[PDB]
Write a protein that binds this ligand. Structure first.
Ligand SMILES: [Hg+2]
Ligand SMILES: [Hg+2]
Ligand SMILES: [Hg+2]
Ligand SMILES: [Hg+2]
Ligand SMILES: [Hg+2]
Length: 269
């Protein structure tokens, strides 16, 4: 049950003006493709706050990757879901090396030690509405908010967003459960930023785990392991939103092209 929105004053949508003339803003299965200019964040923040939305943000920080936690969490505080309930889940082999980062009100952090862990998947179902799973060697530099939230989303690989599907580095060996032939494929998604409802994210990781085990039994490991399985899953189970490469960029490798109005979440040089 969704209560009414309040009165709000904002520019009338223009039915006869395209949102962007330079990029695709909807997929062929009618999922929005999230680029700067597509959304009014005021409208969306109202809709989500009225639902009392909680977002979980999950990161794995093993061995030397613990060093990236401080910048990652500090920048998340400035840019990620500000104003909404956030639960960070930091999975690490070095709990005592997690930095003490100061968090805004309504935000919390759990450190889960990993060897497998003493955390239970039903915990996510009871604690958060959405899960967002990202790489830790990254930093937020601009707004990442509720515009991304949907049952299942993937993010366009910043190296391949302009590429034809034949050029995508999908798994191409028919013996792999990740196999995609040259005449299939919508987009190349990068495993560094994906998410959805808890239920949908758990469905994805369960499917990926089973496919990976099947390949292991058959003596095969897919080319970009996790990524290739992610791409196969999202081919067969279409995401309800796709995020533009604004949401996963590397300015050192790729610069700042005109098509990117904002660089929101980026590789640490
Ligand atoms: Hg627009
Ligand atoms: Hg459990
Ligand atoms: Hg996750
Ligand atoms: Hg992840
Ligand atoms: Hg996966």
């Amino acid at each position: 049950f969704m209560v009414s929105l309040p009165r709000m004053v904002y520019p009338q949508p223009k039915v006869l003006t395209p949102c962007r003339k330079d990029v695709l803003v909807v997929t062929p299965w009618l999922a929005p493709i999230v680029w700067e200019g597509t959304f009014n964040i005021d409208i969306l923040n109202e809709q989500f706050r009225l639902q009392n939305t909680t977002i979980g943000l999950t990161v794995f920080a093993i061995k030397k990757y613990v060093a990236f936690l401080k910048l990652f969490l500090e920048t998340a505080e400035k840019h990620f879901m500000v104003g909404h309930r956030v639960h960070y889940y930091v999975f690490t082999d070095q709990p005592a090396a997690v930095p003490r980062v100061t968090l805004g009100t309504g935000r919390q952090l759990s450190v889960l030690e990993v060897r497998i862990s003493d955390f239970c998947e039903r915990r996510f179902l009871s604690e958060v509405d959405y899960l967002v799973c990202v790489d830790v060697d990254m930093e937020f530099r601009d707004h990442v908010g509720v515009e991304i939230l949907t049952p299942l989303f993937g993010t366009l690989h910043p190296g391949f967003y302009g590429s034809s599907r034949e050029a995508f580095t999908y798994e191409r060996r028919p013996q792999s459960q990740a196999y995609i032939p040259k005449d299939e494929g919508d987009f190349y998604y990068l495993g560094g930023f994906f998410g959805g409802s808890v239920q949908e994210v758990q469905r994805l990781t369960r499917a990926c785990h089973q496919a990976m085990m099947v390949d292991q039994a058959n003596g095969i490991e897919a080319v970009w392991h996790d990524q290739s399985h992610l791409n196969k899953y999202l081919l067969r189970h279409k995401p309800t939103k796709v995020l533009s490469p604004e949401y996963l960029w590397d300015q050192q490798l790729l610069g700042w092209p005109a098509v990117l109005r904002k660089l929101r979440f980026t590789a640490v040089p």
